[PDB]
C-alpha cells in the first residue's frame, strides 16, 4: 500500500493542479486579466 500510494500521489496532484493551472495560464489568464480592474489604469509605469 505504501508503494502504490507513493507511485500514485504525485500523479493525482500533478493532474489536478500542475497540468490544470498550466492550462489555465495558457488559455484563460488574459481573458480574466482584461476583466479584473480598470483595464485602463492597469500597467501604469512605475516611477522608476
Amino acid at each position: 500500500v505504501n508503494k502504490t500510494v507513493r507511485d500514485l500521489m504525485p500523479k493525482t496532484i500533478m493532474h489536478l493542479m500542475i497540468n490544470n493551472t498550466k492550462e489555465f495560464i495558457f488559455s484563460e489568464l488574459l481573458a480574466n486579466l482584461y476583466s479584473c480592474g480598470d483595464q485602463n489604469t492597469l500597467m501604469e509605469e512605475s516611477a522608476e
Binding site: 500500500v1 502504490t4 500510494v5 500514485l8 500521489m9 493525482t12 496532484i13 489536478l16 493542479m17 500542475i18 490544470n20 493551472t21 489555465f24 495560464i25 489568464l29 480574466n32 486579466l33 479584473c36 480592474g37 492597469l42 500597467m43 501604469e44 509605469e45 512605475s46 522608476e48
Partner: protein, 62 residues
C-alpha cells in the same frame, strides 16, 4: 507552498510594472488555491478507496 512561490519568482523579475505583478499573482494564486481543494478531495478519496477491498491476489505472499 513551493509552486505559489515559483509563480512569485517568475512574476517579480519580469514585471517592472506595478499592479500588473499584483493582479497576475492574485489571479494565478487564487486559481491554485481553488485547485488545492479538488486535489485534497481526490487524495482523501484515494485513501477511502484503499480502505475498501484490501486485496490479497496481488504480489504479497500468502
Amino acid at each position: 507552498s513551493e509552486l505559489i512561490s515559483t509563480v512569485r519568482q517568475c512574476t517579480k523579475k519580469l514585471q517592472q510594472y506595478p499592479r500588473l505583478r499584483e493582479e497576475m499573482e492574485r489571479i494565478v494564486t487564487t486559481h491554485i488555491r481553488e485547485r488545492e481543494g479538488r486535489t485534497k478531495e481526490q487524495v482523501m478519496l484515494l485513501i477511502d478507496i484503499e480502505l475498501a477491498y484490501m486485496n490479497t491476489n496481488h504480489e504479497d505472499f500468502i
